[PDB]
Design a protein around this nucleic acid. Sequence first.
RNA 1: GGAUGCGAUCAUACCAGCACUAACGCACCGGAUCCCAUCAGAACUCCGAAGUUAAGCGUGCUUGGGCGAGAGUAGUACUAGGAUGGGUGACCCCCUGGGAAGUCCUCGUGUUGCAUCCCU
Length: 177
Amino acid sequence: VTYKFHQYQVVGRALPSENDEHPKIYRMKLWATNEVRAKSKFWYFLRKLKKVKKSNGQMLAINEIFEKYPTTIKNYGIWLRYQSRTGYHNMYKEYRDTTLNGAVEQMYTEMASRHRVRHHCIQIIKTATIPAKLCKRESTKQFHDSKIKFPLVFKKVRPPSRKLKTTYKATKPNLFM
RNA sequence: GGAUGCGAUCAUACCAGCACUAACGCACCGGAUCCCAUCAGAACUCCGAAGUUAAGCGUGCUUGGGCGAGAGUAGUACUAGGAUGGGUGACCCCCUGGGAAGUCCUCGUGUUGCAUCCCU
Ligand SMILES: [Mg+2]
Ligand SMILES: [Mg+2]
Ligand SMILES: [Mg+2]
């Protein structure tokens, strides 16, 4: 329904000129929180990869890409480049989610946690839906089990809403797995 | 199509080597009485028209040097503005903008005004 990160196809080109009346048309698949930020990052890469700045470029089309089957579970592989405190590195990550938007959200959260990498220090190189038999990370493999079975070792005790919250109770919580 | 006189632009026009040129020219060239000129008629000056296109001038050529233009170097280096951005610091990412320079590679090697004359 609502995602932190949205996937967009951005299409643009250099402004037509007398030497090139039909300049090459470039497309990118970019992740951003909305259309405005997707366009800005599109010109960032075109400026540094194709030497086409926004001042001498033309925005053609921008469309948001939605997950095809948002009700099933897919394995998503993400190839990314990120900047640490001392240089640049490449890494491959895998995630399980119903939509690639969720998998990308997990990637940003994980990078912030395990590496203290902020959002603007990450470039997504490639994304793909990996079949179960081609996954590489064990964090994803262990859930490829037809007889998946485990208990809830840690539960969160709380009333359904704060309406039923009281400071004092006559007895302690009764918990059992 | 060119030359000559005066030029403009001051190397795409310069430098080096090699090759070539009808006609009119431009030259080299002959002489030293006079003007003039020096150690020196070499130069300068004056007078001349036997000889020669050898040189100069002109044109062409060179996987030539230089010069000129493009491409590339490169959205790199650097830089204006922004952040209770990262980092111990040194420094650096990102955001709103601007944006170079050797090497290497390709191409080019003048254009043009007025007047007179030759090709006629
Ligand atoms: Mg003499
Ligand atoms: Mg000759
Ligand atoms: Mg040369």
